[PDB]
Design a protein around this ligand. Structure first.
Ligand SMILES: CCCOc1ccc(C[C@@H](Cc2ccccc2)C(=O)O)cc1CNC(=O)c1ccc([C@]23C[C@H]4C[C@H](C[C@H](C4)C2)C3)cc1
Lengths: 257, 262
């Protein structure tokens, strides 16, 4: 009777996730392990060539790579926002609450999905057209050399769970419906939905990974890791603001971010 | 079945050790707080004058400092109780000795604040084994530095207490907190995860059996671990500010080692 509505919710979220996100984990994995070619950016020259032959839409190199990261993050926010609207009950919530949920949830989701594009050696960029190495990113100067490393460390641990797209679709939804975000006006509806998304995620993981003991608990514990990454990220972005005088963009451009 | 029977046995063991390791339980704390009795009544410290009379009731030169050192001693004592409970956790003492220290190093404060909630309500906190009760306002009324050390704990407490867990639930939960295979610097992560995995199963069954109508309590409880980390970080930072404003205030050696490189 009810275990049916959970599978329906599960399938529904998956389908919606496929529609909203261009580069899925299944695709990114094939590209990454080989069994699928991505242009590789591992040093200054390879970057120079990559952006002149492939011209990635997203003066100093460290500063330009950091900005392309923001640009892509803004692009990603729209995909997540669209995906959110497909979660049963989301659009029916108080409008301000929907905005608050998205405002605080996009960073957690961004790093969660970013892991689907990373391995211990690098990250896929431009919808898989490229692969920027971990070492090259770690070789950037000033405080740019370590803005991505924290995401890599998190990815290696998160990816060990071996979740697939269908697992992630429900996890992303649970992240969005967090009732502890500041400023919420009506927490009950939000938590009632997350509670339903959590039961669906639990069944999904038990069916999809019978051998993975307590994968559910283990995945939920990763929330701690995600928020640490986010808070740490906010603090790095601030320091870049407090200092760094070559970050200037067109006034309209800066408004966009 | 055999499996769940083993998980219930584990829960009983943990609860039994918990009663033996922690003098002041949540059950005793609630009984005092809900003042349903005439013998468990605590003396209430809500201001300076009352504080002065409390010292005569409850059987280094400033108010904030004295209260602060009183907490330092208590947490040091709490660390010793938690360390005693930890040993009862099947498999814990059998792990590499370096990892035992590491697990305790990062787990004691998360557990301390988890358990402290048992002694809190929205208005204050039990002290001196429940004999006294210090109000939230009095504590928030302290000098600029110490004035806001406890507020974050109260905010967590009222929310965590909303879960209405009891001692038997908490015993397995604090056991899970300790057996965290993702602590910084762990040598052999697998044996730790194998134990936590088994504790997580015990906690899951326990919650379902003890709170049948509390949908997804297990998950809600796990998400609370995020709040614990947060309270710990804020506190760590709050201490750095203290040792700079109060060059004359001393921190107990044990706690300094726990916060070191944390
Ligand atoms: C003020 C209530 C706060 O109650 C707290 C708060 C945090 C902590 C742990 C904290 C300690 C610390 C924080 C920062 C740095 C290192 C460690 C930690 O390390 O996590 C423990 C207690 C438990 N506290 C008690 O049970 C408790 C018992 C007796 C008193 C006295 C009250 C007055 C009368 C008498 C003498 C003085 C004044 C002290 C007894 C005060 C507190």
């Amino acid at each position: 009777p009810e275990s049916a509505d959970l599978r329906a919710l599960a399938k529904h979220l998956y389908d919606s996730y496929i529609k909203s996100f261009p580069l899925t984990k299944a695709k990114a994995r094939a590209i990454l392990t080989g069994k699928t070619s991505p242009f590789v950016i591992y040093d200054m020259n390879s970057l120079m060539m990559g952006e002149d032959k492939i011209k990635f839409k997203h003066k100093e190199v460290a500063i330009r790579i950091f900005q392309g990261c923001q640009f892509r993050s803004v692009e990603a926010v729209q995909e997540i926002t669209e995906y959110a609207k497909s979660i049963p009950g989301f659009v029916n919530l108080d409008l301000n609450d929907q905005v608050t949920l998205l405002k605080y949830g996009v960073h957690e989701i961004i790093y969660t999905m970013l892991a689907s594009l990373m391995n211990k050696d690098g990250v896929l960029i431009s919808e898989g057209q490229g692969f920027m190495t971990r070492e090259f990113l770690k070789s950037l100067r000033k405080p740019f050399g370590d803005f991505m490393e924290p995401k890599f460390e998190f990815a290696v641990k998160f990816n060990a769970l071996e979740l697939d797209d269908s697992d992630l679709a429900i996890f992303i939804a649970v992240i969005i419906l967090s009732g502890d975000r500041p400023g919420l006006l009506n927490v009950k509806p939000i938590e009632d939905i997350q509670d339903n998304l959590l039961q669906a995620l639990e069944l999904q993981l038990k069916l999809n990974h019978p051998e993975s003991s307590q994968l559910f608990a283990k995945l939920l514990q990763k929330m701690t890791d995600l928020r640490q990454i986010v808070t740490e990220h906010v603090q790095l972005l601030q320091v870049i603001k407090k200092t760094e005088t070559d970050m200037s963009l067109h006034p309209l451009l800066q408004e966009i971010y």
